[PDB]
Every structure is written in structure tokens, then in C-alpha cells.
């Protein structure tokens, strides 16, 4: 009953789809563009947006005029995962197909636009009523279920940079309890002016205005015995901690050692190790913890993600996607161990250990 990832998709600053993501990672492509003047004033004019992404162009004219970018990113990723390049159905789903999405704080654009209208219109509930449905933190996961007729478990979890790994562990547990036979698992973050200003406000006094990215990574997860497709990777362990002593290096080390022990593997077996590379002291501490723990060749196995910028809740999903893209490109990845880890500003630390198959 080991969970296996049998498919993946990505909408990222590399573009739309897993092939764009795979190519951009392999190329070390730059993704930073000058922000649309339409976004208004920003802490930084440089952003890592999904290129050529228009919500109505991607999703059509029905229910899309007021849709939040977060929801739109998740829906396009869900199409990439369940459909082929021509919209044919690639993955069979049913009422035992779960959905779990990780977020930071949903669409901050939606909630700030709402409150701004509350403060500035003639009365404090005189808001754009058509935007209200899209504001709910669970809207993206619920919209994915409406789109693909997914009557099974539908969950959204927060946790920011670790949210993709909390989502993965949540899916693993509910599958182990028989609540689902398959799961759509991932995480997503929109680019917004509101998010960029809140990040600039929250960052350590006089840190540089961060380069922010966006997108959604999603995986199809099945039980090994029952998989309707070849496994790309087995999920051997997902371990979590809370950094209660503000020592993220020690918290990462302790979390990774437990994840490897629970997987039944030595640190020396780790073939690829991908940290979240938060542009922070916690991010550098995470990097240095891994640089001591796993083989140096594991840290250089997967091209750096740094040119996607800070992708917030998408982080750990993009990290798993980079691992699967590396594994696919290298026959020698078969049966090897990959480690993904992330540290979130709110204290959570998470490490996943995968056996690559393919």
C-alpha cells in the first residue's frame, strides 16, 4: 500500500504544462519580466509570472470574468494532469478520487479588493458581489472538483512553502484509511500586488524586495498495487516539525534524519536533494543543513529553481516536479532516493523521501 505518483502537471513562470516546466528547469531559463503597469505600483518591477496566461483565453467565457488567478492556475494545472494536449481524457477519476491543494492565504487580491470596496464605497458591504464565491480559501480545490466532477474528498490546507508536502502527507494518510483510491495533490500561489506588498512588509527590516513567482504543481497519486499507470516515484516518508527554537538548520536536519530513518534509507543513498531555497536566512540555513547531511552530488543533481523567484505555496510542488523531470531525463534515476524539503516563515518544516521508479 505505498503511495506512488503516476502523473504530474505544472503551470509556472516557465509556461503552461509539464513539458515547458521540464525544459525551463533543464535550460536554467530566466523567467523574470517587467510587471504589467496594470498591476499598479509594486515593491519590485521584476516578477516571475506565468507567461502568456490569460484566464478567459485558457478557461473560456463562462464564470471566468471575476475568477481569481489562484483558481485559474489550479484549473489549468488540473487539465494538464487529467487531460492530454488535445483535451482527451488521460486519467479515469470517480467518487474515490480525492483533491487536496496547499495554499498560503488563498487570493489576497480577492480579499483586499473586497475590503478596499468595503472601506471606500457608499456603504461597507457595497462590494463586487460576483467576486464573493472566489474569495473562499477552498475555492480553487472546489472549482477543480466542479470542473472534473470529483465528488470525493475535497480538502485545502495552508502552510505556505510546506503546504505541498502537508497536502501530500494528508493524501497519503486518507488513502491509507481507504477514503480515496486516487488523489490530485499539489499547491498553488497567485502573483498579486496585495501579496507582493504583504511579503515586502513581512520580510526582515531592510531585506531586498524579493523576486516573486507563482503557479501550481499537481500530482496524481495512486496505491502501488492498484496503479492504472507506471509509477514515477514511491512516497516512502513525509516528516514534519515545527521550528520552535528559531533554529531552522537544526529543525531541517532533525526532520530530514527522521524522514530518511522512516524511509529505511541512509543519507548516503540520496541521489537528488531539492531544498525550497527561500530567499531568507532560514532558506540559507536549510541549504547549509542539507549540504552537510546528503552527498554534495545530490544538491547539484537538479538544476536550481532560483530563477522562478519565490513561488510561495507552489514551492514544494515545483520541487517534486523538478525531481520527476530530472528522474525522467536520467535512466540511472531508477530505484534511487530523492529528498525534497521546505521551511515556511510560520515555523513548519517538512521533508519528503521518494524512491524514483519511472
Amino acid at each position: 500500500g505505498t503511495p506512488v505518483i503516476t502523473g504530474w502537471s505544472a503551470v509556472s513562470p516557465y509556461g503552461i504544462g509539464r513539458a515547458e516546466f521540464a525544459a525551463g528547469v533543464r535550460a536554467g531559463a530566466k523567467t523574470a519580466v517587467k510587471a504589467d503597469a496594470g498591476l499598479g505600483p509594486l515593491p519590485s518591477s521584476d516578477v516571475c509570472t506565468v507567461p502568456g496566461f490569460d484566464i478567459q483565453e485558457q478557461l473560456g467565457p463562462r464564470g471566468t470574468a471575476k475568477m481569481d488567478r489562484l483558481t485559474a492556475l489550479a484549473l489549468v494545472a488540473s487539465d494538464g494532469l487529467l487531460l492530454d494536449a488535445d483535451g482527451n481524457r488521460a486519467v479515469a477519476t470517480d467518487e474515490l478520487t480525492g483533491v487536496v491543494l496547499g495554499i498560503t492565504m488563498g487570493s489576497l487580491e480577492n480579499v483586499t479588493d473586497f475590503l478596499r470596496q468595503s472601506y471606500t464605497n457608499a456603504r461597507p458591504f457595497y462590494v463586487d458581489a460576483g467576486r464573493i464565491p472566489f474569495g473562499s480559501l477552498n475555492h480553487a480545490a472546489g472549482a477543480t472538483a466542479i470542473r472534473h466532477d470529483l465528488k470525493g474528498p475535497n480538502t485545502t490546507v495552508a502552510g505556505g512553502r510546506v503546504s505541498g508536502l502537508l497536502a501530500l502527507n494528508y493524501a497519503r494518510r486518507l488513502m491509507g484509511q481507504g477514503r480515496a483510491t486516487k488523489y490530485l495533490v499539489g499547491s498553488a500561489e497567485e502573483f498579486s500586488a496585495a501579496h507582493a506588498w504583504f511579503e515586502h512588509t513581512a520580510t526582515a527590516s531592510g531585506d531586498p524586495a524579493p523576486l516573486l513567482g507563482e503557479g501550481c504543481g499537481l500530482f496524481l497519486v495512486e496505491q502501488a498495487e492498484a496503479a492504472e499507470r507506471p509509477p514515477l516515484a514511491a512516497v516512502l516518508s513525509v516528516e514534519t516539525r515545527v521550528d520552535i527554537d528559531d533554529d531552522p538548520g537544526a529543525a531541517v536536519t532533525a526532520c530530514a534524519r527522521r524522514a530518511l530513518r522512516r524511509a529505511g534509507v541512509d543519507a548516503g543513498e540520496v541521489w537528488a536533494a531539492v531544498p525550497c531555497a527561500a530567499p531568507t536566512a532560514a532558506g540559507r540555513a536549510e541549504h547549509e543543513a542539507l549540504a552537510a547531511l546528503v552527498p554534495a552530488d545530490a544538491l547539484s543533481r537538479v538544476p536550481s529553481m532560483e530563477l522562478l523567484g519565490d513561488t510561495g505555496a507552489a514551492s514544494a510542488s515545483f520541487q517534486i516536479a523538478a525531481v520527476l523531470a530530472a528522474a525522467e531525463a536520467d535512466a540511472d534515476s531508477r530505484g534511487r532516493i530523492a529528498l525534497v524539503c521546505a521551511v515556511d516563515r510560520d515555523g513548519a518544516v517538512a521533508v519528503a523521501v521518494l524512491r524514483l521508479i519511472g
Binding site: 505600483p41 467518487e95 498560503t104 492565504m105 488563498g106 489576497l108 480579499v111 483586499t112 473586497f114 475590503l115 478596499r116 468595503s118 472601506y119 471606500t120 456603504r123 458591504f125 462590494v127 464573493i132 472566489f134 473562499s136 480559501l137 477552498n138 475555492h139 472546489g142 472538483a145 466542479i146 472534473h148 466532477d149 465528488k151 470525493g152 474528498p153 475535497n154 480538502t155 485545502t156 490546507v157 495552508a158 502552510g159 505556505g160 510546506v162 502537508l166 502527507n169 494528508y170 494518510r173 486518507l174 491509507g176 484509511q177 506588498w197 504583504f198 515586502h200 512588509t201 513581512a202 514534519t240 516539525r241 515545527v242 527554537d245 515556511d344 516563515r345 510560520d346 515555523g347 513548519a348
Partner: protein, 401 residues
């Protein structure tokens, strides 16, 4: 399969703080309705909500600085301290123990988001925004601050953002986590804080009552926004018995369904599937349910649709069906957690909490809502319903140990 029991309840509510006060409020049919103090109500044409009246964070929070949390985080942390004390667990008992900490929320620190936006608006300058607020607005913090307060580093801190069903999802995740064998304890519940965002949202939806919350009433007019936190200590039966814990009740099962239909309307078929899944997971038959703690928000749409789903599953013989939100208003992510604790206390103390403000049952809700006053009953097995925006349904079954 492993049995899971409730050893501790922590309650910060509009009708009582602490297990004893909350039990008295439920039995007495106390109303949580009072004037809003949290924000400026001028222009809403109304100013009633179900705020926690007298919150004293200093009384429960020892380690985490208060300005590291908004009001929702402070409620979650205070309720988690009360829960571990009610369970007879010390910080030393908790320290090593691998645990899940899962807090459900709808809005998290949306009050602090509004205050940040006031700072930008007053200034005409986003540089005027307070870093202290910006650092505490993300929902993931509601779960990590409990681990920090309780000195528990070996924790999976997962905030579940499934809006008005979030407490039930959190308790269920704790049940699944302990059943897995991977942990023997989970701190689970929900927390939210009254805010302009929720008040404005419900007002613009026309979902606010102009006076009182009358779930299942023929002339019901909608909800009052509420807040607070309920935190439940879930333990493996083995672990509870080994340390001589007092057991309030057993977690028998839960059910998750998704309507896959509409982003805000309830769905009779989705709610009915959630109930059936919960009864199947709990291993119980319809006939063994002593009462249902309904999602029961007091809107026209909610109560009609939820009644129809209940009548559907229970085949024209539904059990007593009560609405704790008559007393609490709608505490959002906390609602299903405070409902779950009400259900555990109903089982332990042999009473059904009333549906207050009740004048006449809607003829299209052919239910015994236990109107206005609690009754004594042999309560052994209880269903706690929840539903949310984005079609999310979660139903929890608790039993006697």
C-alpha cells in the same frame, strides 16, 4: 483497527470559556448574541454578532508573545492550553510525543488584513503597513503557534482551510492520523475571529438575520457571525488507558464528500453522501443515532437542503436534529469543532442541547429540533454535520466509550 478517544476539550465561545461554562451554556440555551466591539459597524444598518465577550489571553498563553498572533491564533492557542489541561497532559507529557496539530479556519486573521489595508488607505502608502501584522496573517500560523506554546517540535502543523466545515475536517484528520498508527495524539479543532470581511460578506449575500438566529424556524432570516475556538485532544485508546486518562467520548468515524456542483449553495445529494460515508466509517446504522448536531445555520437555503438530506438518509424517521448555531451564531471554521465538543458533552452528560429562538418549525423540515430548552436523554451516538462553500461536506460520528 485502532480506537480513538476524546480526553480533553478546550473552549473559547460566545456562551462560555472552559468546559464547565460551555456545558452550562449549552444546557441553559444561552445566547451568544451581543453588540460588535471588534470593528466599526457604521453603515451596515445592524451591529450584532456572537463575539467572545471577555477574552483574557494572559490567563492561557505563557510562551508565545501575543503580538505574534491575531485574535484567531490567540483563541486557538488558549483553547489548546485548556484542552491539554482538561486531558491532564503537561508540556512535559507532550514534548517528545509525535503529534498532529490541525486547526480549521474560514478567515484566519482577516481582521488583521483589514487593519493593514486601513494603514495603507490612511497613508495612501503601502510602506505605512505594520510588519508585526503582516507577519501573522497566514493561516498556517494558527497550527504552528500551538506547537510553539506547548513546546512540541515533533508536530505536523496543518491548518485546514475548508471554510465552514474546517473543524470537522481537522478532527477527522486527527482520527485518520491516529488510526494510521503513526501518532497516538492529535490536537484538532477550529478557530476564527469576528471581522469586517465575514460581516460584510454575509450582509451582501442577504444571509444576516436582522434580529436572532432561528434555525429550522418557518420565518428564519439567516445567521449572526461568530468566533472562538474549539480544540479537542484525540488519543489512541491504548495511550489514554496506559496513562489513566479520563475519556469524554469515542471518535467512531467521519465522512468527506464534495458536491462538485456549486461554489456557495448547499447540495442535498452531497450532504446525504457525507452522512452515509460517516455512518459507514463509524460502523453504525441510522437507527443507532440518538441525535444530529446540524450545520443548521438558519438561512432559508441551508436548513431546507440539510433537512431534505437528513430525511433522505434516515428514511422519514430522522432523529432529533438540533442547531448549536442558534446559541453560538456561525463561528465559521470553529463552528464544527464547537459542535463536536457539544456532541461529546451531550454523550458524557446525557442531554441534548436546544435549538433556541424557535417559534414554529418549518413544515418542510419535519424534525424535532428540541426547541428552546435542553432535554435529558440517553445519548450514546451523535452525528455532527458541517457544510461549506466550494461544496465541502464533513460529517463526524462520536460515541460513548
Amino acid at each position: 483497527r485502532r480506537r480513538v478517544v476524546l480526553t480533553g476539550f478546550g473552549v473559547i465561545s460566545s456562551i462560555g470559556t472552559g468546559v464547565e461554562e460551555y456545558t452550562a451554556g449549552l444546557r441553559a440555551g444561552r445566547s451568544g448574541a451581543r453588540p460588535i466591539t471588534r470593528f466599526d459597524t457604521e453603515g451596515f444598518g445592524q451591529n450584532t454578532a456572537c463575539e467572545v465577550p471577555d477574552f483574557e489571553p494572559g490567563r492561557w498563553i505563557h510562551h508565545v508573545p501575543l503580538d505574534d498572533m491575531g485574535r484567531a491564533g490567540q483563541y486557538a492557542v488558549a483553547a489548546a492550553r485548556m484542552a491539554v489541561d482538561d486531558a491532564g497532559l503537561t508540556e512535559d507529557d507532550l514534548g517528545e510525543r509525535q503529534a498532529v496539530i490541525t486547526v480549521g479556519t474560514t478567515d484566519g486573521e482577516s481582521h488583521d488584513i483589514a487593519v493593514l489595508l486601513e494603514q495603507e488607505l490612511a497613508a495612501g502608502d503601502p510602506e505605512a503597513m505594520d510588519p508585526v501584522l503582516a507577519r501573522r496573517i497566514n493561516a498556517g500560523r494558527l497550527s504552528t503557534v500551538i506547537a510553539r506554546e506547548l513546546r512540541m517540535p515533533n508536530v505536523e502543523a496543518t491548518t485546514v482551510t475548508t471554510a465552514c466545515a474546517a473543524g470537522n475536517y481537522s478532527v477527522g484528520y486527527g482520527l485518520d492520523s491516529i488510526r494510521s498508527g503513526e501518532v497516538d495524539i492529535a490536537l484538532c479543532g477550529g478557530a476564527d475571529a469576528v471581522c469586517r470581511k465575514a460581516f460584510a460578506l454575509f450582509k451582501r449575500f442577504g444571509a444576516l438575520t436582522p434580529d436572532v438566529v432561528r434555525p429550522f424556524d418557518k420565518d428564519r432570516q439567516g445567521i449572526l457571525t461568530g468566533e472562538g475556538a474549539g480544540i479537542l485532544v484525540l488519543e489512541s485508546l491504548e495511550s489514554a488507558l496506559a496513562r489513566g486518562a479520563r475519556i469524554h467520548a469515542e471518535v467512531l468515524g467521519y465522512g468527506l464528500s464534495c458536491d462538485a456542483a456549486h461554489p456557495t449553495a448547499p447540495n442535498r445529494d452531497g450532504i446525504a453522501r457525507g452522512i452515509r460515508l460517516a455512518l459507514d466509517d463509524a460502523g453504525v446504522e441510522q437507527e443507532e443515532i440518538d441525535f444530529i448536531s446540524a450545520h443548521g445555520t438558519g438561512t432559508k437555503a441551508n436548513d431546507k437542503t440539510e433537512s431534505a438530506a437528513i430525511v433522505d438518509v434516515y428514511g422519514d424517521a430522522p432523529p432529533r436534529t438540533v442547531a448549536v448555531k442558534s446559541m453560538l451564531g456561525h463561528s465559521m471554521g470553529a463552528a464544527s469543532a464547537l459542535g463536536a465538543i457539544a456532541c461529546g458533552l451531550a454523550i458524557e452528560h446525557g442531554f441534548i442541547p436546544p435549538t433556541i429562538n424557535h417559534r414554529e418549525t418549518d413544515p418542510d423540515c419535519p424534525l424535532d429540533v428540541v426547541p428552546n430548552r435542553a432535554v435529558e436523554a440517553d445519548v450514546r451516538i451523535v452525528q455532527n454535520n458541517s457544510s461549506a462553500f466550494a461544496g465541502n461536506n464533513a460529517v463526524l460520528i462520536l460515541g460513548t466509550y
